[PDB]
């Protein structure tokens, strides 16, 4: 197994396409500020 749960290894993601490259579910295809319109807040951490 290769461990993937180092929180510091994870960074804020780009906006994802959901089903195909032609799907604008989260405005991933947008070239404006709309590209980020569906990003809600997410925290990722290991409790100290």
């Amino acid at each position: 197994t290769i461990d993937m749960r180092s929180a510091y290894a994870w960074s804020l993601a780009s906006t994802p396409f959901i089903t195909s490259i032609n799907d604008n579910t989260f405005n991933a295809n947008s070239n404006t500020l709309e590209y980020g319109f569906k990003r809600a807040k997410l925290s990722w951490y290991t409790i100290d």
């Binding site: 180092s6 929180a7 510091y8 290991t46 100290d48």
Partner: protein
């Protein structure tokens, strides 16, 4: 194989830390008084022949695999009167220095970690009668084996423990063919609060509370040849964890573990006697025993033979031990070797133990 072993914190405390006791099957509770008599029976420091002594012990681990992994011991004793003695010892287990290197140029300032575990104890032994002695020992244990990372805190875990020990040594008794001497001893060890490796009361481990009982006889012929035969019995004073089930399927296991882990160390000491489905015959299965023979020539050469037997259901540590000792003027050298007789790989196989003691000060006559 090993079914339901006793889980205790800091198990390095139970490892023989000197070559003399190791050569005698990891027993010292009823052998003759020596500089190493703190792990085994601090009460016989009051029976020491020399006023004070210092010892260095080295027990290497994984010698074929790496250097500097070892259990080291330094002991000092000082008997002031003919009836009392003070002793302090320091056992240290360490992996050696490890450099934490993540390449990033071959001149980077690298952190060096030294994962280690040590116990520092001091004891006072007092001769009540001319043949009987008692001692009390206080021990500080510190475990620092983990290395700090992100999300791993390598804070050391500590605990305190006390030891109550007694030693009996008769005067020389003439028989038909020899004039022998009898010995007996007990040692209740590592009595203290649970050690919390993760610094949480919910997750704490029993200290390895241990009871050592033993007896010895010395065959003395020609006033300078000695044959010392000793026997030792040892029992952990920790409750045995639950096994298959003793009230769904895993619910019973979790409930049993919960009731086992919510046991105080004081109450756990008394619960060690029992707490198992078997009877007394199967209660004897928790007892380890060791038999040893030591031949002494001029009190300056010793040959040591010992057998150690842990019941293979728990621990499964069974071995034969050979030891030799040499005294030049005031310096004693001891080496010991182990021949394993168990299925499980003993970590101290193919390993030569080394002990070095210096005796100085006045000399006390033996009764």
């Amino acid at each position: 194989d090993i079914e339901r072993p006793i889980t205790t914190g800091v198990p390095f405390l139970l490892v023989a830390a000197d070559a003399r006791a190791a050569g005698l099957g990891d027993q010292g509770v009823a052998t003759s008084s020596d500089v190493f008599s703190q792990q085994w029976n601090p009460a016989k420091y009051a029976f020491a022949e020399d006023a004070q002594g210092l010892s260095i012990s080295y027990t290497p681990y994984l010698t074929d695999l790496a250097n500097d992994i070892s259990l080291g011991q330094v002991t000092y004793y000082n008997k002031i009167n003919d009836r009392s003695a003070f002793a302090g010892s320091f056992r240290y287990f360490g992996f050696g220095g490890i450099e934490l290197r993540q390449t990033g140029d071959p001149n980077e300032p690298t952190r060096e970690v030294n994962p280690n575990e040590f116990a520092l104890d001091g004891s006072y032994s007092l001769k009540l009668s001319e043949t009987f002695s008692m001692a009390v020992a206080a021990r500080y244990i510190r475990s620092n084996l983990k290395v700090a990372t992100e999300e791993i805190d390598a804070s050391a875990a500590g605990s305190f423990a006390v030891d109550v020990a007694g030693f009996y040594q008769s005067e020389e008794i003439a028989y038909s063919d020899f004039n022998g001497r009898w010995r007996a001893g007990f040692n209740i060890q590592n009595l203290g609060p649970k050690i919390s490796y993760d610094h949480d009361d919910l997750s704490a481990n029993f200290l390895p509370a241990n009871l050592r009982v033993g007896g010895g006889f010395d065959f003395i012929f020609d006033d300078y040849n000695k044959l010392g035969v000793s026997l030792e019995l040892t029992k952990l004073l920790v409750p045995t964890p639950p096994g298959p089930g003793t009230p769904s399927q895993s619910q019973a296991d979790e409930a049993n573990y919960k009731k086992y882990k919510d046991i105080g160390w004081v109450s756990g000491i008394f619960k060690s006697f029992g707490d198992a489905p078997g009877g007394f015959s199967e209660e004897l299965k928790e007892i380890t025993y060791s038999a040893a023979a030591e031949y002494m020539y001029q009190d300056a050469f010793a040959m040591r033979l010992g057998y150690y037997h842990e019941s293979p259901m728990k621990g499964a540590k069974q071995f034969f031990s050979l030891g030799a000792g040499f005294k030049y003027s005031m310096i004693k050298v001891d080496v010991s070797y182990l021949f394993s007789a168990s299925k499980v790989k003993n970590p101290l196989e193919n390993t030569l133990r080394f002990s070095l003691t210096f005796n100085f000060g006045d000399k006390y006559e033996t009764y």
